């Protein structure tokens, strides 16, 4: 129980500090690609949005690009709640467009091409591209070391209409930190469903887990120290354990780590206390994470945090089988102390 997991935490601090020269490696590649991409004119607003996207391999990076649209004007694909077209009222962005729609594919494929070049450019340190919507560009920094840049819209206007019932923090948080958090930018990335575009709210993440109390002071002194970021980094290494011990089948392919933080915000949601996250509690606030994602893998429903309206459960998204399996997976672990987190 808690035991066990605070050792299987130590554990992955133990790997997370392999040099962190990789950080500042990722960095300097990253500064340059926007130094050159800042010069030419179809992307002459790029910035970094703000970040790791696996916690058992410390060497593969996540960094988001934000290209700011003004005056853009959204139309829903198809009842999806989720997708969109990207259109407009001269435009910096002509080149990418067909007819009142912005292309997402010609924008990823400029952007493709300016990175090639400038990574053939850097003659100091040994990057290679590879190609395969999100992630846009894969980048090997020397070795091992993997870099997925992505490239998004930014939005500075209300969010749409599709999130209104969502992000229900109002209890746990509160009213005042879920209207101020509404009155941040949204974002639009690549993603088939069409040149579709889909909303985006990874910076939210971030903003939620460095101020994550119910109390203003929590995790800020002795008295009140909880467990949340240990049990998503948890839910977030069961996932990932459970992935690559099936990597060679298809089983898992379709469950992703944006599933586990769902899944995990929902339970803070339904757990408002902090008295309800006590870090002595660790195995038993693991538990109810477990419980909870089991439950949803069995009704078949998950509802996006931001979007209640959209299922990541749905039997038109994941197969009825794969949630079977994975639901047997969990099941077996939970009854078993968690073998799968020994390798
Ligand atoms: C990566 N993928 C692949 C498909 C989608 C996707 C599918 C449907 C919708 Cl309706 C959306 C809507 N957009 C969206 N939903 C999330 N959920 C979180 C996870 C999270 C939850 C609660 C608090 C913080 C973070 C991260 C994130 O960045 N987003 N972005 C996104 N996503
Ligand atoms: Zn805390």
Not at 142 to 167: C, H, R, Y
Not at 287 to 305: A, G, H, S
Not at 312 to 326: A, G, H, Q, T, Y
Request: aromatic share 10%; glycine share 2%.
């Amino acid at each position: 129980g808690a035991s066990k997991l605070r050792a299987v935490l130590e554990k992955l601090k133990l790997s997370r500090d392999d040099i962190s020269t990789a950080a500042g490696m990722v960095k300097g590649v990253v500064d340059h690609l926007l130094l050159r991409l800042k010069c030419d004119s179809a992307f002459r607003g790029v910035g970094l949005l703000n970040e790791h996207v696996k916690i058992s391999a410390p060497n593969e990076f996540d960094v988001m690009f934000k290209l700011e649209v003004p005056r853009i004007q959204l139309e829903e694909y198809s009842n999806t709640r989720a997708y969109y077209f990207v259109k407009f009222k001269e435009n910096p962005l002509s080149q990418f467009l067909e007819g009142e729609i912005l292309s997402a594919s010609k924008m990823l494929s400029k952007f493709r091409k300016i990175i090639k070049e400038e990574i053939n450019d850097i003659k100091d340190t040994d990057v290679i591209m590879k190609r395969k919507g999100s992630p846009a560009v894969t980048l090997l920094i020397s070795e091992k070391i993997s870099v997925d840049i992505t490239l998004a819209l930014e939005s500075k206007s209300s969010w749409p209409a599709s999130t209104q019932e969502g992000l229900r923090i109002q209890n746990w948080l509160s009213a005042k930190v879920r209207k101020q958090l509404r009155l941040k930018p949204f974002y639009l990335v690549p993603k088939h469903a069409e040149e579709t575009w889909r909303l985006s709210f990874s910076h939210i993440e971030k903003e939620i887990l460095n101020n994550h109390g119910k109390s203003k002071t929590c995790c800020e002194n002795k008295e009140e120290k909880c467990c949340r970021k240990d049990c998503l980094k948890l839910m977030k290494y069961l996932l990932e354990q459970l992935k690559e011990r099936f990597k060679d089948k298809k089983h898992l392919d379709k469950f992703s780590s944006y599933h586990v933080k769902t899944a995990f915000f929902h339970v803070c949601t339904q757990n408002p206390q902090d008295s309800q996250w006590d870090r002595k509690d660790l195995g038993l606030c693991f538990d109810n994470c477990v419980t909870y994602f089991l439950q949803c893998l069995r009704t078949e429903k998950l509802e996006n945090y931001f979007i209640p309206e959209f299922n990541l459960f749905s039997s038109n998204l994941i197969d009825k089988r794969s949630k079977e399996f994975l639901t047997k997976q969990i099941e077996y672990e939970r009854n078993n102390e968690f073998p799968v987190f020994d390798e």
